[PDB]
Amino acid sequence: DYSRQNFQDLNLFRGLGEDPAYHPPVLTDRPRDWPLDRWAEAPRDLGYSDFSPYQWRGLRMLKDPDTQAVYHDMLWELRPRTIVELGVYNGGSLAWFRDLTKIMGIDCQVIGIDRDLSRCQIPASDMENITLHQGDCSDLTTFEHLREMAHPLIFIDNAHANTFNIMKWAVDHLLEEGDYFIIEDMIPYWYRYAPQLFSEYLGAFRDVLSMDMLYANASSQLDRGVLRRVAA
Amino acid sequence: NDYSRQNFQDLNLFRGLGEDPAYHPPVLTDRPRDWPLDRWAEAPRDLGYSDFSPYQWRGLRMLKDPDTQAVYHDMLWELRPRTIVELGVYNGGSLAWFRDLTKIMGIDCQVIGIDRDLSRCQIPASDMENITLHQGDCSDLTTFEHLREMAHPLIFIDNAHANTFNIMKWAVDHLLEEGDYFIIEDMIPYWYRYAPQLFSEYLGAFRDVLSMDMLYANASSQLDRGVLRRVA
Amino acid sequence: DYSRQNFQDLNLFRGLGEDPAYHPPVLTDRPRDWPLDRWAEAPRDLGYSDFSPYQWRGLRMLKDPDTQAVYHDMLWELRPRTIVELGVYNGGSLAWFRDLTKIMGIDCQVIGIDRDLSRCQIPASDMENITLHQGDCSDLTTFEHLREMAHPLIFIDNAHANTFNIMKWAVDHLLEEGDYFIIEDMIPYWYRYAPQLFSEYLGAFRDVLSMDMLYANASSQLDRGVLRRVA
Amino acid sequence: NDYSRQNFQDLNLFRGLGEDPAYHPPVLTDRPRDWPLDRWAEAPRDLGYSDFSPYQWRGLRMLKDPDTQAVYHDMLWELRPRTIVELGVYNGGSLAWFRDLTKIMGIDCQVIGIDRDLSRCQIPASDMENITLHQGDCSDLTTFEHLREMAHPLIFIDNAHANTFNIMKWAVDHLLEEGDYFIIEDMIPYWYRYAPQLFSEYLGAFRDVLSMDMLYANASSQLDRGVLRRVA
Amino acid sequence: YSRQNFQDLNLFRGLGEDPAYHPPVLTDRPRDWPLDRWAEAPRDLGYSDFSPYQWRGLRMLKDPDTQAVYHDMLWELRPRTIVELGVYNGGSLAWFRDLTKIMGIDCQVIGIDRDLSRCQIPASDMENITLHQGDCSDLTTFEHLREMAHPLIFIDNAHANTFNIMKWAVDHLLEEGDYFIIEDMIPYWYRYAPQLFSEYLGAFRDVLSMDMLYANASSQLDRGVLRRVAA
Amino acid sequence: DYSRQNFQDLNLFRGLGEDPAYHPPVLTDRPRDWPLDRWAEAPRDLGYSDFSPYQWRGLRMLKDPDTQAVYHDMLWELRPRTIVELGVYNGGSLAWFRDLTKIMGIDCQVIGIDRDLSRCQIPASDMENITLHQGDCSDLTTFEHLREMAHPLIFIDNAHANTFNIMKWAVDHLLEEGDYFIIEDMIPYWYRYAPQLFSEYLGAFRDVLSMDMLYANASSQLDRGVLRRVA
């Protein structure tokens, strides 16, 4: 029935899905064990929904395998001492960045920054190398607090509110040479909707930032949003 | 160096809309408008401008694309609605359209337009016969409690997408009679990716009161599986 | 039925279909009302032939919505007083130009020309500002007989017969600075079969005609065929 | 003013035929015919000329593309035809091809050409063995009587497409035998797209006497769904 | 199954299990589809489109698009001698001979291979074709033939030791205007060894050239048509 | 020039490439730093050969990120105490498996096998729990010399010789309920090249092995190769 129900806002779920806990996909319309003597007879598509079906030790990943492939290459090149996500959801990306700099012999500090850090599904006792922080984007004191951080640094942006003042402040009071400011997912959508202003705003950074063309065309998500600092 | 001699804005605002609600025509960059016929074959065969939201009607911007337009023609012609409503307004270009078409078709419709910010609206006052703007939110349902029993048949369109199931719930129990439509543009395919289970339920609780109208349902990218009506 | 039925030269319908009168599409492999408790299991395709579904007030359209949006832009910018369609079929294009100019507030006179106006479907009543004309294109008296038209103006060829002579006449006798001559559909085809002869022809007009590259690439049907007097 | 005194031949004449029935091989424009191997990779990968009707056979043009040819090759092998009829000659390239193949295959097969206009036929007289041309129109069925009952089996091929069903009618009642082919190259899809109802109803008529040969019928773009043959 | 031996399915790579031509068979539908249900009939081919091709009851691994190219090439440059290196069932062999026969070309076909046993050409049908057993690794398999008339086309369908074989040809065989072609494999050699293939290939700039008329005209011959240049 | 040089049989590089050591991509047609005042005018294509540009801590990877996602999910479910790569080339996938089971907290011992181990690239400082063997697949001795190892067990065929015969001995002598046996890459090629046999051979194992549909369709490389043991 409809007349006895109250509905949520499914907008809260965009680019995220329902639940930050991992769901292990199950098959509906086929047996896991397909009989081999009917090999050709078996269906070729997935079996389940390919929305965001990507995990890391039972923790959901918002970055697809290609975006992972990029971040791996980038990490192995820069040996980044600090990696700062800005937008956390379930924390999987944080548990990845840690687990990865670890086997790379990079002693790295991974920092999450979300105003709501309650969706984090990481075990209490898996949090070696990590520092969370609560703070809204429209206030720049949030980011000052972490200025005595080792370099090289990679600032990823995954909320993307007040991003441009965060960039202006970054350049003016944080990024050393060849540190990465990365805007994930949205940059093309800003050029879709607002071409005149975007091309002005980005174009203002002409002399301090620049797109890194090794990584910038190498994944759907990072497409055209990977930046770093120059000498000037 | 233009970075610090500028204050930057929020550009998330323009998502789906574009920076200016007033119509500006396309202009050409890499070609002339007047291609010489001696070199007809040399002519570039691509468009020449942002294919984002080029469309228009009588000098006002239009967000419904030509296919969508088409569908609402066939729809209006078949149904002959005495009322159409547009939750969500922006430049009010689609209101002018709905009004002009019904007029040409001999239909005595009244177009309504419910926004919170009508300031963007662009129609000349002098050209507003059979159009009414109401202000208010999609959160609380009083915005709609003053919508009189206007004439039927009646088409409801959601374009804001906020609390758009509680507004569905109100429309079914208070307003829609047989044959009346209720159309969620744009958003139904994204809600289905981001919540396959929850959406399939919320939507299914209208089993006995609403059916998707296949004739128009799969005939536009914007109206894609977002066209519903009553059969009580 | 093979030893009885006699047949209709089915080439007649090449391009237009069987019935010039509109008939809404009906479903076949479907209910119209798909149940919402099965929303995710409903077909995604259209469910009816997408040949020419398009219409304008019970009249057939053979200008897909995209082409429709082009001429609209064109009509808005130019504000023409005359729009000569050439080839009528059902006259859906006729009524839709007169309707559209009407809302735009423009004093416009639509004129269809065709060797056969017997499939025109326009209601008797809805004929304000539409002047029909009978005559073959391979007769240039079809064109002389025309009284003087007002400007600015657009000339649309959908008959694609003896078209280059008709370009010669129109330039010589009718078209003014800024006026369009628009060949729908056919340009790429001629350029596919006779590329050498097509250029020869098109290129003669280099001093009197240009491709308006603002509209020229904005619709399959108008693909590289929107011309107008640069003068 | 090159237009003032240019004799404008009617361009509709060349529909799917071209300017000239005489074969002339294609010609490079933007690229040297011999490419230097030092710059191998920077050599362009697009054809070079117009893919409109590039094909040929012994200096005669071929309107039947290689996909269509393969089909005819397999059908000639299987059927070992004793007679083959073309309705619509043009340059008669297909006429030569059909005969040259039947000779190689070791098949006594008279080839026959029918056309109201045989002035474009390019087959030299010295190479006319086993090929009989025929002046005549489609409308007039008298034309087909003097097919002096040729030997079977037998492939009828409609390339003219005029009064076609009224030829089919004749052929069935007068010329075809258990296994003989009646084939309509190209049009069948276009008639279905233009006259959906009347075409099914017309094609339905020949149900008892004819079948589509599903082996060949989906086998080339040009022969597509128009390879028919005598059942029972 | 536990006392079974399984063959190397890589022996059948790009060839298939049987060198004989058998004709395709429809499983899921009738050969004779009924005309009342014409619109419901499958649009898809109806069987495996991997090497479905044949010439007079022999399998053809050259597909139609490639045959059209070789025809143009034969017709233009009447060759006195064609050389396949790679034979399989010999359909390319008896094809190359048959075309030359209808063209009035006095042309000798020769096929060379370490394995001929898979050849399906009957003895009655060997006129002007000649088989040879020899290995690529060994260059002395080839000098047997520098008493062969020109013009000459020389196809590589084997892919072993190719670059050494090319250089033997350029030095000891090809006269100006003659063809050496590599079917299928150049584009994979470029994929796999960008730097080494470009080298091995650009060594022959002073003696060979990519024929641009014949090169981009099939899948199989992609960028492998080469010929001898003016000295 | 050519007549001096010796040419490696370029087919040795089929599916692998020239250098087994990793090298990072190098841009040719663009700077690495594109200026922001002309962001919109930058190229959208990659900038290098997408042939096999993937890596893992300085070692090349021939499994693509898709395939690496499937192998993750698999490991995390099975927690294999033994993985067996059959074919090794640069040893990169050998390491990746060892690295990943390690951080998952699994005590898994990775095993590679090859006829040729000289290409392998893994530093000995970083060799923990990786065991190599030399041996042809040809010879069933290669495997009988393999010592007992712990389950659960994934057995990957990445080299594709004698692949079915190996499967037979794997089922008889090595595999156990729940253990895998995955033929990466080749199975879809064997279906096109040899359908009749490929089915008779695969289906001969119907009683013992099954296609794990959860992973067997989630990667173009693993596509329809993922088998697993089941009583």
Ligand SMILES: C[S@@+](CC[C@H](N)C(=O)[O-])C[C@H]1O[C@@H](n2cnc3c(N)ncnc32)[C@H](O)[C@@H]1O
């Ligand atoms: C939208 S999610 C990340 C999704 C990711 N961009 C994707 O689609 O792949 C970003 C997180 O940042 C938080 N967030 C949004 N705006 C913020 C702000 N202004 N300051 C701090 N956190 C914010 C949200 O609560 C949310 O959990």
Ligand SMILES: C[S@@+](CC[C@H](N)C(=O)[O-])C[C@H]1O[C@@H](n2cnc3c(N)ncnc32)[C@H](O)[C@@H]1O
């Ligand atoms: C997609 S635009 C409207 C499109 C409009 N029908 C047209 O085509 O011209 C979305 C509109 O919804 C309005 N809107 C967004 N959130 C709203 C809310 N919570 N309550 C009422 N209106 C809202 C915005 O002001 C905006 O004008």
Ligand SMILES: C[S@@+](CC[C@H](N)C(=O)[O-])C[C@H]1O[C@@H](n2cnc3c(N)ncnc32)[C@H](O)[C@@H]1O
């Ligand atoms: C394609 S239909 C018209 C299309 C329609 N007006 C539109 O806007 O899309 C072409 C029309 O031109 C007519 N026609 C064909 N040949 C003609 C000729 N030689 N002279 C005059 N009219 C001709 C036909 O009778 C037919 O009605």
Ligand SMILES: C[S@@+](CC[C@H](N)C(=O)[O-])C[C@H]1O[C@@H](n2cnc3c(N)ncnc32)[C@H](O)[C@@H]1O
């Ligand atoms: C497409 S061409 C022939 C194609 C050629 N047979 C082939 O191999 O594909 C069409 C031919 O039909 C002929 N034709 C057109 N109308 C005809 C008619 N009414 N009666 C007989 N032949 C006609 C034309 O002269 C023209 O040569």
Ligand SMILES: C[S@@+](CC[C@H](N)C(=O)[O-])C[C@H]1O[C@@H](n2cnc3c(N)ncnc32)[C@H](O)[C@@H]1O
């Ligand atoms: C692709 S098939 C030949 C294709 C066929 N001739 C055609 O025209 O399409 C490959 C052939 O090359 C032969 N071959 C492979 N390696 C060879 C070598 N090293 N020496 C001689 N022949 C070889 C094989 O015996 C096999 O017959």
Ligand SMILES: C[S@@+](CC[C@H](N)C(=O)[O-])C[C@H]1O[C@@H](n2cnc3c(N)ncnc32)[C@H](O)[C@@H]1O
């Ligand atoms: C696709 S690569 C293996 C990639 C491997 N997964 C990795 O990255 O670690 C193929 C390998 O199979 C090996 N190989 C080929 N034939 C073989 C055979 N008959 N016996 C053993 N190894 C063989 C080759 O030497 C080559 O190293």
